[PDB]
Amino acid sequence: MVEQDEQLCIETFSKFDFYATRDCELPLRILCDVANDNLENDDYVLALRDLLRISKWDPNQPVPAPF
Amino acid sequence: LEDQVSIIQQRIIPNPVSQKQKIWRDRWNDLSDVPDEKTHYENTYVMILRLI
Amino acid sequence: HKISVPDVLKLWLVDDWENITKNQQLIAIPRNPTVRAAIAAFRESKISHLNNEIDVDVFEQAMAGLVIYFNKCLGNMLLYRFERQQYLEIRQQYPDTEMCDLYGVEHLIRLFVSLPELIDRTNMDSQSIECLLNYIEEFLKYLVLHKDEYFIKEYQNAPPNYRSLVGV
Amino acid sequence: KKVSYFYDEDVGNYHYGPQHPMKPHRVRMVHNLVVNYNLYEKLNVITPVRATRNDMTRCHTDEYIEFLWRVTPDTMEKFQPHQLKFNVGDDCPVFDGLYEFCSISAGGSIGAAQELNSGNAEIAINWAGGLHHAKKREASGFCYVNDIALAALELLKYHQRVLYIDIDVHHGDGVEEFFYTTDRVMTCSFHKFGEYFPGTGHIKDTGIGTGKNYAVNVPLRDGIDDESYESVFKPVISHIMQWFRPEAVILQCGTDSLAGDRLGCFNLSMKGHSMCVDFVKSFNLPMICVGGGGYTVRNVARVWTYETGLLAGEELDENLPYNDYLQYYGPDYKLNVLSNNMENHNTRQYLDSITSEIIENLRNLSFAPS
Amino acid sequence: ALLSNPEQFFKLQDSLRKFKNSECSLSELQTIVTSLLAEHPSLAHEFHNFL
Numbered sequence: 032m033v034e035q036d037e038q039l040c041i042e043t044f045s046k047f048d049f050y051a052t053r054d055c056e057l058p059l060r061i062l063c064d065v066a067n068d069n070l071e072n073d074d075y076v077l078a079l080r081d082l083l084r085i086s087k088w089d090p091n092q093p094v095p096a097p098f
Numbered sequence: 099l100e101d102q103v104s105i106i107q108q109r110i111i112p113n114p115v116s117q118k119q120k121i122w123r124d125r126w127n128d129l130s131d132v133p134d135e136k137t138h139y140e141n142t143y144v145m146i147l148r149l150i
Numbered sequence: 151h152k153i154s155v156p157d158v159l160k161l162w163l164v165d166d167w168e169n170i171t172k173n174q175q176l177i178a179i180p181r182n183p184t185v186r187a188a189i190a191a192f193r194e195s196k197i198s199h200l201n202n203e204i205d206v207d208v209f210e211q212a213m214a215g216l217v218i219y220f221n222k223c224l225g226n227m228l229l230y231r232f233e234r235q236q237y238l239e240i241r242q243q244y245p246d247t248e249m250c251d252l253y254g255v256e257h258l259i260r261l262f263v264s265l266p267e268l269i270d271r272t273n274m275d276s277q278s279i280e281c282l283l284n285y286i287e288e289f290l291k292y293l294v295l296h297k298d299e300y301f302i303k304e305y306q307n308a309p310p311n312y313r314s315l316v317g318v
Numbered sequence: 319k320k321v322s323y324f325y326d327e328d329v330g331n332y333h334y335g336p337q338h339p340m341k342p343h344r345v346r347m348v349h350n351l352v353v354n355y356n357l358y359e360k361l362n363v364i365t366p367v368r369a370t371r372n373d374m375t376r377c378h379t380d381e382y383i384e385f386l387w388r389v390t391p392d393t394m395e396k397f398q399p400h401q402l403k404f405n406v407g408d409d410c411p412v413f414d415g416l417y418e419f420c421s422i423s424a425g426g427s428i429g430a431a432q433e434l435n436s437g438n439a440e441i442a443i444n445w446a447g448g449l450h451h452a453k454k455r456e457a458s459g460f461c462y463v464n465d466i467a468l469a470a471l472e473l474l475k476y477h478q479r480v481l482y483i484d485i486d487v488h489h490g491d492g493v494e495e496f497f498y499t500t501d502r503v504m505t506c507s508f509h510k511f512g513e514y515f516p517g518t519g520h521i522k523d524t525g526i527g528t529g530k531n532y533a534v535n536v537p538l539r540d541g542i543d544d545e546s547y548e549s550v551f552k553p554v555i556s557h558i559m560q561w562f563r564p565e566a567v568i569l570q571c572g573t574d575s576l577a578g579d580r581l582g583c584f585n586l587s588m589k590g591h592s593m594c595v596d597f598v599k600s601f602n603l604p605m606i607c608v609g610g611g612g613y614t615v616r617n618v619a620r621v622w623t624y625e626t627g628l629l630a631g632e633e634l635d636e637n638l639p640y641n642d643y644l645q646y647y648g649p650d651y652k653l654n655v656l657s658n659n660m661e662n663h664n665t666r667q668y669l670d671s672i673t674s675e676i677i678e679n680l681r682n683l684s685f686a687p688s
Numbered sequence: 689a690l691l692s693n694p695e696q697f698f699k700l701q702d703s704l705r706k707f708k709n710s711e712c713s714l715s716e717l718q719t720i721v722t723s724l725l726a727e728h729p730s731l732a733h734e735f736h737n738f739l
């Protein structure tokens with residue numbers, strides 16, 4: 032069992048690396064070039080809940096200002 | 099701890115203002131006959147043998 | 151010479167012992183149901199069903215003895231060492247009103263439950279003893295029945311200044 | 319000159335008692351080391367304006383403040399009952415100029431807050447203040463008036479959220495009790511829990527009402543050192559600044575968490591107690607650095623002088639210059655406070671567990687539907 | 689910090705290219721970011737937290 036497990040894992044290396052270690056710069060892409068994904072919109076909900084809005088219009092994607 | 103030896107020696111260093119105020123009492127004048135080997139570990143080892 | 155206290159009242163008495171002594175909780179002294187009020191309610195309820203004038207007379211004089219003994223007894227053998235501060239504060243606040251108009255059933259039942267050991271030293275006639283004791287039994291039953299209205303619901307925490315004042 | 323330094327040349331002349339730990343003499347020591355390090359030019363020195371009864375009744379009760387105004391070491395015998403009601407007389411002794419000292423400290427704090435509001439400064443230093451054990455209606459822990467709370471109220475007139483960071487070895491019981499039911503002030507306190515003075519400060523005290531998850535308590539065991547304190551302090555403060563983003567920070571730079579303290583039981587050094595100040599300065603928020611505990615005057619003076627220099631930006635020398643208090647400093651005459659051995663007791667599992675709990679609490683403010 | 693349009697347009701496009709894999713392994717990305725962000729050392733130093 033150990034041998035089979037190790038074999039599978041050590042083949043899935045070289046992809047674990049690419050998809051888990053460059054995972055910090057793709058969020059930067061979908062933040063800079065503002066493309067709406069689920070986690071971006073959840074972060075914007077987080078910022079709204081920090082600022083405590085009530086009934087006015089949401090300003091924009093890059094201009095809620097807890098900067 | 100060979101590098102920590104030098105770090106602590108640098109830490110205990112006289113202050114010129116204290117020297118000019120005539121209040122600095124050096125600490126080397128309290129040690130007894132210190133051995134002269136190549137390494138601080140060898141000196142401490144000779145001291146251990148002396149205690150033994 | 152013994153009484154029949156319901157188990158609900160026993161549980162309530164032990165819970166109040168614990169709350170006042172160990173947990174540092176007191177009772178709001180100005181009560182909405184007064185001691186005099188409860189005494190009058192039970193008196194009216196029993197007389198409205200009593201049978202003969204001799205019984206009416208003995209019950210009336212029993213209730214009178216009860217109220218006068220409460221008013222004369224409360225501040226001597228009815229409070230814990232954690233309530234004497236509150237007692238003197240209440241006496242300073244209302245020095246003209248009286249205890250029968252101030253305190254509540256939470257202490258009237260201490261009086262009732264403790265009555266046996268007092269009638270132990272007292273040695274009046276067995277007829278009077280049994281009349282008074284049956285009256286106390288019926289009163290305890292009436293209170294544990296009407297629990298919802300006579301008894302307090304939550305206790306009150308003593309403030310830090312009060313605790314530093316008592317310190318005992 | 320964005321650092322406004324508050325110091326009243328009288329603060330050092332008030333005396334607590336025969337052998338009491340708290341000595342306002344440390345402020346005078348700090349100021350002399352400063353004026354002889356020449357920080358007096360890079361700083362901005364303001365002699366504070368004294369508080370008033372109307373200024374202290376904002377957080378304290380009128381009867382309590384009137385008692386503090388009327389008491390005297392002679393009439394104490396006649397004022398005996400109100401003393402035992404107001405906690406003044408056993409470990410918060412009644413001495414000469416009590417009201418004057420309280421006024422000096424509270425005026426320093428309120429002036430710091432007003433400077434941060436008016437914008438003339440971004441860092442405001444007041445060492446005479448920081449009494450964080452005072453409560454709404456009684457003194458406690460060598461403290462009488464909660465200048466921290468008065469300062470927070472003055473900041474909230476212009477700022478929407480305020481953080482208060484206590485690194486004194488005791489719990490910030492007074493400030494926590496003051497702001498326990500509000501979400502506009504978050505109180506993060508690192509302290510030694512167990513058989514220690516305030517008694518309060520469990521990891522579970524997290525607020526009630528609107529201020530649910532706005533008190534953060536980090537309990538710690540005996541003998542924490544620089545690395546352990548860093549590992550518990552940097553994550554928690556970063557997570558706080560992320561989830562509850564404040565516009566102003568009030569840092570209680572209490573130095574009874576140092577090594578060799580008459581009442582503390584920690585093992586921090588000058589570097590471990592200053593990495594905190596550096597981490598908090600690194601966010602470019604307006605901040606009030608207030609004093610606090612600290613009962614060994616040599617360590618206190620040198621550490622606070624170093625922290626003043628670090629906030630001003632200048633890196634002070636390593637040799638103490640000529641001051642009127644030179645003999646106080648030991649057989650080395652250096653600006654440093656070394657640590658001792660005092661075997662640690664905070665295991666990595668303990669620190670990681672308490673940190674994970676605090677992080678979950680802070681996250682629940684924005685997860686966890688309303 | 690970058691009021692001018694083309695600077696941040698360039699950073700947008702370059703991060704986009706790195707995501708879409710139309711550029712090399714972080715070499716040209718690091719070079720172009722450190723170039724277009726070279727008058728602001730604080731941001732140049734903060735970009736390293738994403739590498």
Ligand SMILES: [Zn+2]
Nearest residue numbers: 486488574611
């Ligand atoms: Zn302290």
